Structures are given as structure tokens and as C-alpha cells.
Ligand binder design. Structure first.
Ligand SMILES: CC(C)(COP(=O)(O)OP(=O)(O)OC[C@H]1O[C@@H](n2cnc3c(N)ncnc32)[C@H](O)[C@@H]1OP(=O)(O)O)[C@@H](O)C(=O)NCCC(=O)NCCS
Ligand SMILES: CC(C)(COP(=O)(O)OP(=O)(O)OC[C@H]1O[C@@H](n2cnc3c(N)ncnc32)[C@H](O)[C@@H]1OP(=O)(O)O)[C@@H](O)C(=O)NCCC(=O)NCCS
Ligand SMILES: CC(C)(COP(=O)(O)OP(=O)(O)OC[C@H]1O[C@@H](n2cnc3c(N)ncnc32)[C@H](O)[C@@H]1OP(=O)(O)O)[C@@H](O)C(=O)NCCC(=O)NCCS
Ligand SMILES: Nc1ncnc2c1ncn2[C@@H]1O[C@H](COP(=O)(O)OP(=O)(O)O)[C@@H](O)[C@H]1O
Ligand SMILES: Nc1ncnc2c1ncn2[C@@H]1O[C@H](COP(=O)(O)OP(=O)(O)O)[C@@H](O)[C@H]1O
Ligand SMILES: Nc1ncnc2c1ncn2[C@@H]1O[C@H](COP(=O)(O)OP(=O)(O)O)[C@@H](O)[C@H]1O
Ligand SMILES: Cc1ncc(C[n+]2csc(CCOP(=O)(O)OP(=O)(O)O)c2C)c(N)n1
Ligand SMILES: Cc1ncc(C[n+]2csc(CCOP(=O)(O)OP(=O)(O)O)c2C)c(N)n1
Ligand SMILES: Cc1ncc(C[n+]2csc(CCOP(=O)(O)OP(=O)(O)O)c2C)c(N)n1
Ligand SMILES: [Mg+2]
Ligand SMILES: [Mg+2]
Ligand SMILES: [Mg+2]
Lengths: 559, 559, 559
């Protein structure tokens, strides 16, 4: 005659869908779900703010391809978590945000309930679907919907609202076991038509100057050998987007990443694989594409992404593994890309890399490192230790790290993404550490870091093998902007503080690095320790430029 | 350097996407769009209310498989039209609502502009996507995005906001030539994996009492010979939903439609093809399905529709043509459905139809026909004249017509749909007439009809071959409900009026049919005439039941 | 031990708040509420579409100053009703939209429930507040909130969602009577500060060329003697907005309505009383105000309406009765407005009225009346019969009727309003007839009429003393627009049909008027009959201009 309850049926339902981890912050009305999650034997990571719990869930979805689960409380907690859900949806990362909510009777009459919000309706602009499980019997189906909505199609955020009265509901164990079920094939393959592939095959076979653009959807797809086999069999030069670095090793001879401007302006055919033609690509128009409409081949699971920005000549709609498998067989035996195109790009790549190596070896005063020589140490380390996640965010700290730090392994580089978010660092660190079981290095702008810095304590509390490298130049872009008025600090200034001391305040290992040699030693020691560390790398306050590579996007007064 | 403007570029862009028809109502700011559309040699149907121009667009989309286009004015006009957009999206009908909108400056500051509304944001819940084209250079891409969103994936409504200032913008004709383009493959094939098909084939193969449910998604797919070859090769009994009637001829030997309750309740495997397990299927639970969980196969283009209500043993995700084509090859040579199961349902169907024949053949007083003998006439007409669109809405008027009137051809029956909308009648009539160029018969409940009845004048003004049959029983369900108080008319009562006089008021032909013989002679004459007609079929006020077949869904006071 | 239920507690609660009338359309899940409303002895008006039920509720709120109550069904019915709620909110008319909705469990998981919609969340852009009563015990409080939100502050639409499961809930009679209560003072007076009034008093006392603008909020206020006493004591010339006609008799010697352009362009101080400076006033800027910022005094209950468009020099925030009472005492004994300002305007008024009388007496062919001589008959009739509601809508039909037809009594003229809505006519007629118990005349554009025409049957079914005058010129603005192509009708054309026949089809009295004399006789006979009548006034198809007075707002192609 045994009875179960809503707490347990939700635990069983999440387990049934292969969820063993949540990230969140406890409190009414969901503390005892968090407790019982752990009692059952599943891991819960408590954070210092729900936002960073949510950035954690978001990147766990990217890495694994099953939704990261974030757990928050009502109204204020939910709001913090849904800013992260918003982010997940924008980047196409599977993520379920679960939140407690209050009394339906009181919320609907807007009477002033404890943490009152229509969280279901507030979530809607920020996810693919916003649900609410009202009754115990619908938990399994409710969770199935959330998982399918997150993983299927273009993947993304789902919000599941959990009224406080869901949890204390009861049901027989025989009924619950009756209702509990595991979805068949929640992220199905979607195969494109033969003519879609043949139209693409035609454009590529006739290309004089082809290029392949790999985006983070391609990385997410987890079909690395087959994407690489496409590149190698076709002989086509390729470029990775920010988080597509390492999908093919960044030192692959066919990479044109070190000659991007030229390669994009001069190509005729451009093969977009899991890459939107959004602002990161200047919308497929302007001088970055030579002021012309290229012949775009585009592979994407989202049908209506095609023609979003420019006319796509060969739209291939489907999942990237399926599409790429067919395109390869379609291109089988075709001649390789033009040898004087591939040669021209390689000569540019060689030359630009020789030029960068010169900057990385240059000497600077103690405590006045620049971005080249500081990050040249991380470059060298990551070439030797590739099986490590690189978390990265900032302006100059992000741009220069993407240029300098070669990724040899896929799904390791985790950065600001589609929205250029400052705030993802410490959440990404916890999640990368949790889901990989391997070391994490973070290259943080100091401003960037301030958006999630308190989570240092969380990294310490779980004893995670994470090394936070702070690029401490004392401000946003630069740390030397003049006081606008007598004794008034500039808006872009930050305290050139002892972030190493802060790390040590919570049981972490703090370092200061005033030279490339000090940073090299500290990084090697930090990673090898297998312990929470922070390296306070001292960068020249005059080293950076305004907004890094995207300076031109700034609005300036001409009066 | 000759110039063109927004008016002409929009027209060209629409034409390039194979749109040649718009349904709407003119006025500030879009009257001169409609005129210029007509001047260019395309067709504009002006209605008496935008809702009906809208329902006209939605069903044009269903029948043609390219989106119907509704044009309306700002705030109030838009609102009227958006209610129809909502319905399209709910029914998976491709549709685009183009609405003029007011001044951004003024609307954004909520200052009280002419017909002030943020129509783009207000449209959000009622459509797949809600766009705005602010600039003349973005019209080709804006129209491409609208088209692709309406017809790709699960089809549905798209709203496109056309601010007043868009139209008077100018651009060189040469630059406009450069910007105009035709989307490649806007409604692409999506093919399922081998193992998804193999799982479904193995369910069907080992089924003891299988059944195929055909929904209006299977009808919409326009792969009638694939769907029929699957039914006939597998030997599986099938059942159509309201608008799937005629996809296979309703009198097909394998149809278990006339024995639905017993087939649904007793099947072990149920193959849903373009049919949601929503309220029309009692959500796959309850007495209707014998209080058990069936083994569902389900073919649908929308991945997250699976497990929406009940677990789906074999989910096959893709477009129905692609999926059915593959499933057919997988099952090739497999035994046909159990003979004692197909024959058992056939005996049930024969005896059931023989019972209905007796009801249709029976005799009633003059001016007091029932639903059987009145609609028995329309049944006979449509069997001999199947190439005619059948528009249908009401309670008893709908339910009984669905039962009685056999459809032998696909995409002819157009009814209330997923939301059970009273109001679709006269717009459906105008669009069916315009896109098919063939006759239409409408079986309208007298209440149903009053939601769109003023559009008789539209049907007359365009001289359309539409024969509206009003089932005039004098109210909602029944026309005899007693006066609740002395000299106070009940809320369900309607004037048992001369709808024939109303039709003739606008130049149409009117009939009153008091007997089956009078209805038959009027229908044969009306349909043969090729002119706008209305038959006022006088039905017994006491012939109906509460809410028809779904009378149990009513909430009653038990005190 | 007696039990009541949700149906009855809602009836008692509405009764308790002085509601004795609803307008709507029945069907699941609210038919038996409608039935029991009547059983109890309260009136229910069933319409042919929920939209017009809602336009009825909206104008019943304006007229009475207690919210009009509209009742609809779920999803599709709600949508139709909420287009009207939207309208109520925009015009500041108190109105409660009550709608049935479906199962919370199924709607929240978006599973496909009968008429599935989050109606509560869909309503939000279109009302002041959107509530949902989930439980029987909260009905009295739920209704109290709705009534207060509708009547208090700036009055407006409220949506109350009524889940199907609300109605079948039970409670003891002693509990229900315990919970049932009548709000104290739901539309409270709001008195402005002495300095607000003194700032206004200062501007008026120093005015060389003052004008008072009366809007429909002033009419709604129901303080006619005191508003008139302000005008008369100050000697200031005044202008009424569309529905403020008759607040003071339109033939008042101080009216500058017949010299509007001059009065507005030339004034220094402008006293806005319950009138927004929205598009109806060209936003307080441009040539209609002489290209200058006037010194505006503005009385409004909505604090943040001040400075919405132009800087307001003397903002007086409060309810108009309270404000006007204080301003009068503040102006007591002050000299009257400049005699050569008042004289100059009177000379213009006299002259322009003499000019209009000349057009009203001019002869036209049979069946080719113009707007002056046709409406000059209605003018003369309304001067003799002022205690009658004039419903009015159209382009030329509205503009010319506002100019020509003098209202001597307040809250009688009911027109298209802030949004210039075509669709309000027949609903306004039913409601005006219901709440006044007196005759109604409608002056309808023929296009205008088509948006609500089927409700003719509703007017007949309740035997209402309503006379519909159709201004039948055969189209939108004009009825003579050339066929754009061979045998293709223009988009602005309408059938010059026999709307008299349509009226008679439902038991009404139909007239055709081909001359002013025929229209005069028909109108006198129609009103005096006390019965549902329609007069099909035949207007010259070439008589009207594009969009009437607001022609310049049209967007035209210059290429
Ligand atoms: C928008 C964006 C995609 C544009 O790309 P980009 O910066 O112009 O190009 P890349 O970052 O790939 O490369 C930078 C330059 O270094 C060069 N380079 C790249 N890799 C190199 C390598 N390994 N060795 C030598 N040179 C290299 C490239 O050639 C390029 O210069 P080029 O344009 O003259 O060819 C990119 O700047 C970006 O992802 N921005 C994110 C900014 C953000 O969101 N942060 C927060 C906002 S303040
Ligand atoms: C909900 C719904 C799908 C349920 O299906 P249903 O009505 O029970 O089943 P059908 O309409 O297919 O068939 C009706 C009955 O007539 C019988 N029948 C069907 N076709 C027949 C035929 N041509 N000859 C003889 N009998 C027939 C069936 O056996 C069935 O009864 P059963 O339960 O004993 O088997 C259906 O009622 C529906 O589409 N409702 C829409 C109503 C609506 O929109 N309401 C408007 C607002 S009030
Ligand atoms: C926008 C609006 C407020 C502007 O006001 P307007 O039309 O310029 O001014 P009025 O309607 O009060 O008066 C019209 C003219 O007739 C004159 N007039 C008014 N009453 C008169 C009378 N009784 N005798 C003689 N002349 C009169 C006025 O002097 C004015 O002309 P003027 O500007 O040269 O002085 C007005 O046109 C309006 O309410 N429009 C509504 C349109 C709508 O919503 N319909 C649907 C849109 S198509
Ligand atoms: N499995 C998959 N197969 C194909 N496309 C995918 C898959 N997962 C995600 N996508 C698509 O990949 C794209 C990711 O692009 P974007 O986030 O812009 O990448 P980047 O910023 O790296 O260019 C999205 O358009 C998304 O629809
Ligand atoms: N071309 C297509 N291929 C596959 N599925 C489709 C296609 N077009 C529409 N659909 C699906 O068909 C379904 C229609 O179901 P529904 O509207 O409930 O039909 P019914 O009411 O007849 O059961 C939707 O779930 C939709 O996603
Ligand atoms: N009792 C009241 N006292 C004061 N102001 C009111 C009252 N009721 C409504 N109002 C205000 O009256 C105004 C009505 O203006 P509007 O609808 O633009 O009128 P018009 O169109 O006639 O100019 C609104 O701004 C509203 O806030
Ligand atoms: C939440 C959020 N706030 C603000 C910004 C704008 N922004 C871009 S980069 C940046 C910080 C740049 O400074 P830093 O992280 O120290 O990198 P640096 O250039 O100094 O190396 C900010 C605030 C943002 N992208 N996200
Ligand atoms: C817009 C809208 N309003 C109300 C309803 C509720 N409703 C369902 S059926 C129906 C009409 C039933 O009467 P009728 O059309 O005459 O069919 P009958 O049963 O009398 O044959 C109504 C109003 C609805 N479905 N849609
Ligand atoms: C719901 C809605 N649709 C469209 C319009 C645009 N509109 C303004 S007036 C008008 C009709 C004008 O014709 P009519 O009513 O016959 O008046 P007339 O000028 O011919 O006398 C229309 C459709 C509107 N205001 N509201
Ligand atoms: Mg910095
Ligand atoms: Mg009826
Ligand atoms: Mg007209």
C-alpha cells in the first residue's frame, strides 16, 4: 500500500532521463528536493548566486549534449536563473531550469504571495518552451517534454515551473512506476534530401576558392572525425569560430584561422557548418566579405535559419552528422581544392604566425606583461596539456586568448559566446570540472571575473581542479584612464587588487605572476596540484585596446 | 537612375515567393498596397471583417501548402486578423499576416498615435515568429523569413509588421534587382533514421490488432498515394480525423471510421500519421482507449510533439512523405493485418452504416427535418459530385455532417478544427472557391453561421460558386429552450430567420427547404448554377443534443 | 448543512457589486452560468459573435460608470471578446471580460486541451489587470478586485479568467455568505492640491485667448452642470471632442466647435478636461496649433498622462468633478474671457454654420443624396428628439455626422473612438438600448456596418427600439472606383445591397430612402414605432472623400 511523493517522483523521473547532477541555490520551497537529490546519491552543486548555477547548467549541456539542470527558488531566485536560461537558448545549449513557485490561488489574484511571480509566463521570451507541472501524475511526462524540447531540433533552454504544492502530493508506488518512463530517441537524426546535398556538392566541386566555417553547433554535434574527414578529403581550407577551436586540432595544416580577413573577403564558396551568419560573421555582408554575396552552403538543423541574413545557395537542413556523412559520399573522388588557393592561404598563415611568435617572446618590465607574452605561456602549456577545458572571457583577454591559445581537443574552449557575456567564467569552471573529471584553466579579464568572482568560494568548497588566471590590468580594456575630475576615478577603472588573497580566503592557492617565467611556473604547479588555484597575472594597464577586436562597434561622440 | 519604392518592392518580393492572392480589408496605411497589388494584375479579396479575411488565408495555406496571406490595417484591424493567425498556428496551417503599423517614435513612447499598438509584440503568442521590416532593403529577406517560418518544420502562422514609413521609402531599381531573391527549398524534406523506421516496422509487424489514425497533417502533406499504398499493403484498418476525411475515400473497404469507439478501445498498436494525441483523441487515455497505454507509432515533423501526452513506443520524426515512403519499404512483403480483426471491424462498420441508412431514409414533417434525412441529401450529392469543397461548422451541424457526408477526395472537407472555432465558415468558402476554382458547399449551424454571416455579401460580390446550407433549427443546439422568465428569451434561442432573404439582399440566390426533396432540388440547382446561393434548411428545433458529440465536456450545476 | 457552488457564488458576487446584465455568447464551459444568471432573474444578451458582446459591455461601462460585463467561452471565444477589452482599455471604459478556460494541468503542459490557451497571460497587453479565480472561496475578492481595477484610477478593461473547475466547486451557504461582501467606495474621489489649482487659475486669469477642450473622460465623469458652470462663469469658448458632444448642448452660444482650426491655432491657453493630447489633437504640435507650444492646463486622473506629448504648464491631477469644483471656486469673481476673442470666434461660428445650412438644403437626384442633405434630416430630428443615443461610425459617415448632428444631451453620442474602430455599431446599439431603456439611432457607414452587421438579428431578437441608418454609397469612402483590370472589382467596392431586406429577414422593419423627404418620414416613423428598424439611405457613390477629414494621414505612392 506504500505511498511515494512529488519530491521522489521528480527525482526518479530526472534519473530516468539520465540526469545525475544539478547546479543551484537552495531555500524555500526546494531545499528538501536538493537534500533528497543528495540523499538518493546524486550530486548537487550549491553556488553563491543562481545565475552562475545556470551558466554551469548551460555549459554542461553544450559539453555532454544532455540538458544541464539548474534548480532555483521562486521569484528572485528564478529571475537570476532565467538570465542564464536566456543565454542557453541564444547559444543553442540544452538546459532545463527547474524552479519552485508559490500558491496558484494567491499569485493569480496578485495578492502578494511569498516571492510572487508568474514565472511560467515570465520565462517565455527566454526559452524554447515554458511548462508547469501542477500534479504528481504528470511529472514523468512533464520531464520528458522538457528534455525533448531542450535536446531536439535546435537545442535550447526549457523552463519547468514547480509549484510548492507539487512536492507534498502523494501517489501509490505501483502508480508512480506505472507512469515513470524513458523517452525513445529524444534527439533524433534528421537526414536531408539527396537534392539538397547534391546542390551543395555542385557548389563545392565548382569552387575556385572554397572555405569551410565551423561553428560551435558543429562542435556540439560530436562528429569530429567525420567533420575532419570532410575537410581532409575535400582539401578545403577551414576556419573555426570561437568555441569550434579544437574541433579539428588548431594546428591542422588546412587551418586558415590565422588569415581570416583575407580568406573570407576572397572566397567564392563558403560552407557554414553549425554556424549562424549573425554579428560574429558581420551578417554575411560588408567589407569582411569583399562587398559581395558569396555562394553559401549552409548545414543547420533549424530550417528557418536559412536566408535569415543573406540568400543561401545550397541550404542543407538536418543534423550535422547526417548531413556531413551524405556530403562526403557525395564528394567522394572529387579533385581537392585549388592548390594555389590553399597555397596562398598557407603562406599567409605561416607569415602571420611567424609574426605572432615574435610578439610572444618579447620582454616586458616586471608586473607589466602584455597579452602576447603572458598568453604565450598558456599557449605552450595547452599544446602540452590539451585534455583540459579552457574557460575564457573579457575584451582583450578573450580576443587575444582566442588568437594565441591553440586548442587541440574539441569542446574544451568555453567562452563568452553569442551574446559576448561577461559572467560565464566561474560557472563554466565548476560545470566543466564536474562533467569532465579533468583540469580546467580559466583565462579571465579582471572586469569579466567580477561578474562571477564570488564563485571562487564554490570552486574551493568542491575542491575542483580549477586554475583561474586573472588578466589583471586594472580595468575595463585598460587600467590607466585619467580621472575625469579632481579626485574622481574613471568609470573604466578597477582596483588592481590581490585576487590571489581572495582565493586564499576560502582555502584556495593564490599566486602572483609578474613575469612570463613566474606565470609559467605557477600554471604548471597549479594544474599539476589538482587543486583550486588562482594566478594573479599582472598585465600592463596600457596594454589593451578599447573592446579588443570589436572596437569599431563602439558609439563615439563626434561633437 | 530610376527609383522604386517599398510598395513595389514588397509586391515583387511577394510575387517572387509565388504569392498571387491576398485576403483583407483596406484603410490607412495599407489601402494603396492593395490597389497596386490589383493594378499589377494580382488578386485582392476585400472582406467585411479582417477575421474572415484571416480564416480565408489560413485555409488557403492548408489546401495549397504555401502560406495564405492576410492584409490588414493597424491596431483594431490587426487585432481582428491576429485572432485568425492564432487559429492557423493552432491548426498547423501556413499563414502570413501582413499589417500596417503606425509611427515607431510615437508608439514606443506610448504617446497616443493613430491606431497605436506594438503589434509585433502583441502577435508573439499567436504565431511561430513575429517580424518587422523597418527598411526597404530588407523586404526580400523579411518576406523570405516569413515564408520559410510558415512552411518549414511544423507549419503555422507568421506575423510581419509593415510600419507606415516602410512603403514610401525609395531605392534604385537596379539595387532592388540585386536584393530580390527566391528562397531555395523553403519547405524541405526531413528524413528519419533507419533504426527509427525499423522500430516502428517491428511494432506494426508484431501487432495483433493494429490501426492507422490519419490526421490533417497527413492530408496537408500531399502524399496521398504513399499514404494509401501503406494502408492497402499492410492491410491495416484506418480512421481519419475530421479533415483527413477523403485522403483515402471515406467508403474505402479498410475504413473503420463507422466503428471508431470499438477500434480505438480494442487496438493494441496505433499508428498516428500527422495527428496529435490531443483532446480530439481524449489524450490517449480514458474509456475511449480501454483504460490502457497503447503502443503508439507516431510520424510527425515536430520532434518535441512526441511524449506530449502519452509515451510513444516508436517515434518517427520527419515529413510524412519521407517517413511513410521508408516505412513502406521496411514492411514490404510482411503479412497483412490479422484477417479476423479486419473482418471483425468490417462487420461492425456494415451494421453501423445500415443503422444510419434507416435514419436518413425516414420521414419528418414539412419544415421539421432532422439531421439524418437533411444531411442524407448532402451525402448523396457529394458521393456523385466529390470534386467540391465541403465547409462545415456547428455543434450538431458539424458532428452529424462529419458522420454522414462521405468525402471521396482529399483536402475538400474544411471544418472547425483544433479550437472548435465557430466563425471559419464564410472565409473558408471564399478561399476554397478562389484557390480551387470549383464549387463549395457549406453546412452551417445557424449559430455557427452568425459569426461570419455578413460575409455572404463578399461571396456575392465576387460571384463565387458557393452554396451555403443553413441548418436552421432556431438556436444553439436546440431552438425550443423554454423562456427562463416571463417574456424573457433563453440565451440559446436564435431567430429562426429568413437567411435566404439576407442572401438575396446582396444579389445571391435564396431557397427555403422544408423537406429532403426540396433540399435536394435546391442543392442540385444551386451547385449547377455556379452562382452564390443559400439554402435555408428548416430543421426541427428539438432535433439536436447539447453540444453534439462532446456534450459530456459541459460543466453542469449539481446543486 | 446546505451547499452552494461556484456558479451561484459568482452570481451572488456580481449581484453584490450591482451587476444585473451581461452580454455574451454561450457554449462550453459557461452556458449554465448564462442560464442560471437568467434563472436568477438577471438579463443576458446573447450575440452572434463575442466581439460585439464586448463592444456592448465596453459602452455600457462608459454610459453608466460601472463596468460592462462580457461573458465568453475559452480560447477562440475569449480571443474575440478580448479584442473588445483591448478597445475598452484604450478608451478608458470600465469593463470586465469573464471567460471560461480549460484544465490547468493540460494547458500548462501544452498537451492540446479543449480550446487550449493561457488566456490570463494572453489578455495582459489588453487590460489594466488580468486575474484568475482558481477557488470558490476567492470569488467575492476576485470580483471586488476586477470592479475596483475597472472603475478606479483611469478606468479600463479587466480580464477575469474562470477555469471550468471553478464552477462545480462547493461550499456551505454560511461560508459563502461569510465571504460575500460589497466594496466600500470603488471609484473614489481624488482631490488635487491647492497649488495645482492655483497654477491653473493663474494661467486662465491671464489668458488673452483661452479655450476649453472637453473630451470623453469629462463626459464619463457625470458632472455636467459643474463643467457647464465653469464654462459660463469664465466666459471661455469651448470645443467638444467626438463623444463629448452634448456634455454642454452643442448649440451653446460659447461653442467654438464650428471654428475649430482657427480657435486651436490662435489660442494662448488651452484647458484640456478629460482629453488626451493624442493623435485626435495632432499631439499638441504642428500647424493645427500654430506651430507653437501653448500654455496647457490639463485635468486628468492619470498622473503620468501629464507631459506625455507636450509640456503641461498647469497639471491638475485628480477626478474631474473634484478638480472642476475647486477651479471654479478658484476663479470665482474673475473677469470673463476677452470679449473680442469670444466675439471673433462667434462670428466665425455663425458664418460657418450659415454656410453648412446652405449645403443641407441643396437638392440631389433620387437615390443620390450627399452627406449634407441626408444628415441634415438626422440633425433636425435629433434637435427635436435629444433623449436618444446616436451610435456612429465610418469615414465620411462619421466625420460628417459629428459636424452636422448636434447633441443636446450628454453621453448619447457613441462613436469609433480613440482607435477609430469599425465594428462598434450594433453592440453599442444593443447596450445603449439595454442600459437607457430609450430609443437608439445608428448612423452607419456601409463598410463600417459590415464589421458588426449580423448583430441586426440580435437587435431584432430582443425587440430593441433601434433604428440603423445605413449610409449606402456602395463602398469604402466612395462606391465608384474603377475596375483595376477587365472584370475585376476594386478593393474599395461594396455591393450597394438591400440592407432593408436583410433587416426584414429577421423580423425587422426595412426602409429604403432615396431622398431627404423619404429619409425624414422613415426616421420619424421608425423611432416612434419603438421597434427594430433599418433605413437604407441611398448616398451618391461619388459623394465622399478618401478617409474623410483624416485623408492626409494616408500613405501614397509617389512613383
Ligand atoms: C567578431 C569576431 C568573430 C571577428 O573576428 P576577428 O577578431 O576579426 O578574427 P579572429 O579573432 O579569428 O582573429 C583575429 C586576427 O588575428 C589573426 N590570427 C588569428 N589566429 C592567429 C594565429 N594563431 N596566429 C597568428 N595570427 C592569427 C587573424 O588573421 C585576424 O586578423 P585578420 O582579420 O587581419 O586576418 C571576433 O572578434 C569575436 O569572436 N569577437 C568576440 C568579442 C566579444 O564577444 N567579447 C565581448 C565584447 S566587448
Ligand atoms: C472529439 C471527436 C474527435 C470524438 O470522435 P467521435 O465523435 O466520438 O467519433 P466520430 O465523429 O468519428 O463518429 C461518431 C459516431 O458515429 C459513428 N459513425 C461514424 N461514421 C459513421 C458512418 N458513416 N455511418 C454510420 N455510423 C458512423 C461512429 O461509430 C461513432 O460512434 P461510436 O463511438 O459508437 O463508434 C469528435 O466528436 C469531434 O471531432 N468533435 C468536434 C466537435 C467540436 O469541435 N465541437 C464544436 C464546439 S461545441
Ligand atoms: C482627427 C479629428 C479630431 C480632427 O478634427 P477635425 O475633423 O479637423 O475637426 P471637426 O471634426 O471637429 O470639424 C470639422 C470641420 O467642420 C467645421 N465644423 C464643425 N462643426 C460645425 C458646425 N456645426 N457647423 C459648421 N461647421 C462646423 C469645423 O470648423 C472644421 O473645419 P475647420 O478645421 O476649418 O475649422 C477628427 O477628424 C476625428 O475625430 N477623426 C476621426 C476619424 C476616425 O477615427 N475615423 C476612422 C478613420 S478612417
Ligand atoms: N546537432 C546539430 N546539427 C546541426 N545543426 C545544429 C546542431 N546543434 C545545433 N545546431 C545549429 O548550430 C548553430 C550554432 O550556431 P552559432 O551558435 O551561431 O555558432 P557560432 O557562434 O560558433 O558561429 C545553430 O544555428 C543551431 O541551429
Ligand atoms: N508535412 C508534414 N510532415 C509531418 N508532420 C506534419 C506535416 N505537416 C503537419 N504535420 C504535423 O501534423 C500534426 C497535425 O495534427 P492535428 O492538427 O492534431 O491533426 P488532427 O486534428 O486531424 O488530429 C501536427 O502535429 C504537425 O506537426
Ligand atoms: N473621472 C475622471 N476624472 C478625470 N479624468 C478622467 C476620469 N475618467 C477618465 N479620465 C481621463 O480622461 C481621459 C480621456 O481622454 P480621451 O479618451 O483621449 O478623450 P477624447 O478622445 O474625447 O479626447 C483619459 O486620459 C482618462 O485618464
Ligand atoms: C553582463 C555584461 N555587462 C557588460 C558587458 C560589456 N563588456 C564587454 S567586455 C567588458 C569587460 C572588459 O574588461 P576585461 O574583462 O577586464 O577585459 P580586458 O580588455 O581588460 O582584458 C564589459 C563590461 C558585457 N559584455 N556583459
Ligand atoms: C467563437 C466561439 N464562440 C462560442 C463557441 C461555443 N460554441 C460551440 S458550438 C456553438 C454553436 C452551436 O450551435 P449551431 O452552430 O447552430 O449548431 P447546432 O448544434 O444547432 O446544429 C457555439 C456558440 C465556439 N466554439 N466558438
Ligand atoms: C477594424 C478596422 N478595419 C479597418 C479600418 C479602416 N477603415 C476606416 S474607415 C473604414 C470604412 C470607410 O467606409 P464607410 O464605413 O462605408 O464610410 P464612408 O466614408 O464610405 O461613408 C475602414 C475600413 C478600421 N478603422 N477598423
Ligand atoms: Mg581588464
Ligand atoms: Mg443551431
Ligand atoms: Mg461607404
Amino acid at each position: 500500500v506504500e505511498l511515494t511523493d512529488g519530491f521522489h517522483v521528480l527525482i526518479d523521473a530526472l534519473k530516468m532521463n539520465d540526469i545525475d547532477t544539478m547546479y543551484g541555490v537552495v531555500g524555500i520551497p526546494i531545499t528538501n528536493l536538493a537534500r533528497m537529490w543528495q540523499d538518493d546519491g546524486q550530486r548537487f552543486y550549491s553556488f553563491r548566486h543562481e545565475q552562475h548555477a545556470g551558466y554551469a547548467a548551460s555549459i554542461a549541456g553544450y559539453i555532454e549534449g544532455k540538458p544541464g539542470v539548474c534548480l532555483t527558488v521562486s521569484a528572485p531566485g528564478f529571475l537570476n536563473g532565467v538570465t542564464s536560461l536566456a543565454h542557453a537558448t541564444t547559444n543553442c545549449f540544452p538546459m532545463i531550469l527547474l524552479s519552485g513557485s508559490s500558491e496558484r490561488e494567491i499569485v493569480d489574484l496578485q495578492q502578494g504571495d511569498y516571492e510572487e511571480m508568474d514565472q511560467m509566463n515570465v520565462a517565455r521570451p527566454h526559452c524554447k518552451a515554458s511548462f508547469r507541472i501542477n500534479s504528481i501524475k504528470d511529472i514523468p511526462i512533464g520531464i520528458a517534454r522538457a528534455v525533448r524540447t531542450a535536446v531536439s531540433g535546435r537545442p535550447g533552454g526549457v523552463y519547468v515551473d514547480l509549484p510548492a504544492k507539487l512536492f507534498g502530493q502523494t501517489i501509490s508506488v505501483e502508480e508512480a512506476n506505472k507512469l515513470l518512463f524513458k523517452p525513445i530517441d529524444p534527439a533524433p537524426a534528421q537526414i536531408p534530401a539527396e537534392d539538397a546535398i547534391a546542390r551543395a556538392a555542385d557548389l563545392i566541386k565548382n569552387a575556385k576558392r572554397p572555405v569551410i566555417m565551423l561553428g560551435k553547433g558543429a562542435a556540439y554535434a560530436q562528429c569530429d572525425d567525420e567533420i575532419r574527414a570532410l575537410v581532409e578529403e575535400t582539401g578545403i581550407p577551414f576556419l573555426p569560430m570561437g568555441m569550434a577551436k579544437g574541433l579539428l586540432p588548431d594546428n591542422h595544416p588546412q587551418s586558415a584561422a590565422a588569415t581570416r580577413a583575407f580568406a573570407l573577403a576572397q572566397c567564392d564558396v563558403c560552407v557554414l557548418i553549425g554556424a549562424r551568419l549573425n554579428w560574429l560573421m558581420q551578417h554575411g555582408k560588408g567589407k569582411t566579405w569583399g562587398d559581395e554575396l558569396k555562394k553559401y552552403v549552409q548545414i543547420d538543423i533549424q530550417a528557418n535559419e536559412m536566408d535569415s541574413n543573406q540568400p543561401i545557395a545550397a541550404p542543407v537542413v538536418g543534423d550535422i552528422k547526417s548531413a556531413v556523412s551524405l556530403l562526403r559520399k557525395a564528394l567522394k573522388g572529387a579533385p581537392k581544392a585549388d592548390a594555389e588557393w590553399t597555397g596562398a592561404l598557407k603562406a599567409k598563415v605561416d607569415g602571420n604566425k611567424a609574426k605572432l611568435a615574435g610578439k610572444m617572446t618579447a620582454e616586458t618590465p616586471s608586473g607589466m606583461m602584455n597579452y602576447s607574452n603572458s598568453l604565450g605561456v598558456v599557449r605552450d602549456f595547452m599544446l602540452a596539456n590539451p585534455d583540459i577545458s579552457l574557460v575564457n572571457e573579457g575584451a582583450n583577454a578573450l580576443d587575444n586568448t582566442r588568437m594565441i591559445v591553440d586548442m587541440l581537443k574539441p569542446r574544451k574552449r568555453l567562452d563568452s559566446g553569442t551574446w559576448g557575456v561577461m559572467g560565464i567564467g566561474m560557472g563554466y569552471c565548476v560545470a566543466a570540472a564536474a562533467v569532465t573529471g579533468k583540469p580546467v584553466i580559466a583565462v579571465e579579464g579582471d572586469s569579466a571575473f567580477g561578474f562571477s568572482g564570488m564563485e571562487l568560494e564554490t570552486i574551493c568548497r568542491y575542491n575542483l581542479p580549477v586554475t583561474v588566471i586573472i588578466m589583471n590590468n586594472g580595468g575595463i580594456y585598460k587600467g590607466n584612464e585619467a580621472d575625469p575630475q579632481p579626485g574622481v576615478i574613471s568609470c573604466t577603472r578597477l582596483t588592481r587588487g590581490r585576487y590571489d588573497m581572495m582565493m586564499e580566503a576560502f582555502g584556495g592557492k593564490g599566486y602572483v605572476a609578474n613575469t612570463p617565467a613566474e606565470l609559467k611556473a605557477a600554471l604548471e604547479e597549479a594544474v599539476a596540484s589538482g587543486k583550486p588555484c588562482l594566478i594573479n597575472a599582472m598585465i600592463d594597464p596600457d596594454a589593451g585596446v578599447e573592446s579588443g577586436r570589436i572596437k569599431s562597434l563602439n558609439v563615439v561622440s563626434k561633437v
